Amino acid sequence: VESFASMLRHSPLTQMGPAKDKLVIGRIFHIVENDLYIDFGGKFHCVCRRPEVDGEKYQKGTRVRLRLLDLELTSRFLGATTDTTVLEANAVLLGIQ
């Protein structure tokens, strides 16, 4: 049990601040049937499919750069007084290394 203030201050999710146009690198947390849900900390992980340019290096423990765009994805529809979450992020993929 160390200092609670410093630990709450210096943290990855808090150090990255408001994720917006930030190239983040990470690995895949779980192989998908035919997708490519690559993780990278933050609050959620991106969602996409395997790219045509080099789509084999993606392994459980790799390092591929992302873009991080909208880590919330929510919108009050019609009468839903609350929000409708999707647990996604959706970001433009760059490549490998």
């Binding site: 998908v32 049937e33 997708d35 969602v47 499919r49 529809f77 019609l78 999707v86 996604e88």
Partner: protein, 86 residues
Amino acid sequence: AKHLKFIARTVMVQEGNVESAYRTLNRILTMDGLIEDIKHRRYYEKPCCRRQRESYERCRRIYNMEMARKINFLMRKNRADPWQGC
């Protein structure tokens, strides 16, 4: 019988493509509501009924916009299962 009618709602046709100009005119009538204008001015509708119909049209437009937004927002999941464990 008042002004030059060759310029009022006179869409040009290119290469005899009357279908394109006709489709543009129909889209104009629909969006702007000129067909609706004719249908509503041809005969009378109670001002109470008119306001109720306007409110119903606003409600229908809101419903259609929300449906389109929900479709465009949830079409992102058109992929596959994430885990497939339970």
